[PDB]
Amino acid sequence: LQIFVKTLTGKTITLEVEPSDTIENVKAKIQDKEGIPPDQQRLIFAGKQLEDGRTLSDYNIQKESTLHLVLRL
Template identity: 50%
Template structure:
């Protein structure tokens, strides 16, 4: 049977397999077909998505109920990312001679606090605007004579 694999560049690859084919062999086929120009993603780095789910290497096509002419989406796996962030922080701290990590942390925390404060203030404002009695605004501790 034939299935299709679409990579991040939008290129669609045609793969031939049967129902008992494992996902790891599909990854190998994708790598050999996509690596003609040297830009292919190696099989351990590939993530194959079908129906919104990431496919496990040890399972077969039949396990995921992949039918003929179905399209699999191939992406690269994101491993870590923390190393890149630490590298950027170290480069900035060496280049500018300032403790950049503390600065980034303070900026991040201050933005979080600022957005939370704005959200609470907006919620309080909307709540007091909606609570009214006989056309008059009802304050926290006083109710108009009608509601007593």
């Protein structure tokens, strides 16, 4: 599976994700490609702010789905 994460910059980053990956696993993938501690990350999917511990499949995030990243303080 691959998904896109939109930054505040506008710049788009593809992410290789397993379908059962938790939102932490996603934040820690972004920790890798950008370098933003998961605690400063806030991810959004169709307006729903996604929660650590639930998985991509719990929120029905699928191939080529877009998450919007925004920061926390």
